[PDB]
Amino acid sequence: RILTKPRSMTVYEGESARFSCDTDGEPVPTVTWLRKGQVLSTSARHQVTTTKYKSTFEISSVQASDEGNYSVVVENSEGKQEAEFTLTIQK
């Protein structure tokens, strides 16, 4: 599980904070980005997303959320895993 975890960083605002991880599953695992930042939103405030075997979350307009420690809990159609990191922001 957790084929690869997203590193970390510190951005200012919609400057990058790009993230992308990898995870196996059967069929395909599940992912839920979140970290006391309102589940890293998904589109109204963040460009979060997930693919067949690789997910990723980007921030081109961080809002109230985004403050530092940001993680991704990815299940496995039966199991549960997680990769935590820390992306802060400077409004």
From Swiss-Prot:
It is found in: Cytoplasm; Nucleus. Autophosphorylated. It comes from the Eukaryota. Isoforms 3, 7 and 8 are expressed in cardiac muscle. Isoform 4 is expressed in vertebrate skeletal muscle. Isoform 6 is expressed in skeletal muscle (at protein level). Transmembrane segments: none annotated. Residues 1-88 form the Ig-like domain. It is linked to Myopathy, myofibrillar, 9, with early respiratory failure: An autosomal dominant myopathy characterized by adulthood onset of weakness in proximal, distal, axial and respiratory muscles. Pelvic girdle weakness, foot drop and neck weakness are the main symptoms at onset, but ultimately the weakness usually involves the proximal compartment of both upper and lower limbs. Additional features include variable degrees of Achilles tendon contractures, spinal rigidity and muscle hypertrophy. Respiratory involvement often leads to requirement for non-invasive ventilation support. ZIS1 and ZIS5 regions contain multiple SPXR consensus sites for ERK- and CDK-like protein kinases as well as multiple SP motifs. ZIS1 could adopt a closed conformation which would block the TCAP-binding site. Belongs to the protein kinase superfamily. CAMK Ser/Thr protein kinase family. Interacts with MYOM1, MYOM2, tropomyosin and myosin. Interacts with actin, primarily via the PEVK domains and with MYPN. Interacts with FHL2, NEB, CRYAB, LMNA/lamin-A and LMNB/lamin-B. Interacts with TCAP/telethonin and/or ANK1 isoform Mu17/ank1.5, via the first two N-terminal immunoglobulin domains. Interacts with TRIM63 and TRIM55, through several domains including immunoglobulin domains 141 and 142. Interacts with ANKRD1, ANKRD2 and ANKRD23, via the region between immunoglobulin domains 77 and 78 and interacts with CAPN3, via immunoglobulin domain 79. In some isoforms, after the PEVK repeat region there is a long PEVK duplicated region. On account of this region, it has been very difficult to sequence the whole protein. The length of this region (ranging from 183 to 2174 residues), may be a key elastic element of titin. Key component in the assembly and functioning of vertebrate striated muscles. By providing connections at the level of individual microfilaments, it contributes to the fine balance of forces between the two halves of the sarcomere. The size and extensibility of the cross-links are the main determinants of sarcomere extensibility properties of muscle. In non-muscle cells, seems to play a role in chromosome condensation and chromosome segregation during mitosis. Might link the lamina network to chromatin or nuclear actin, or both during interphase. This is Titin. The chain holds residues 33489 to 33579 of 34350 of the full protein.
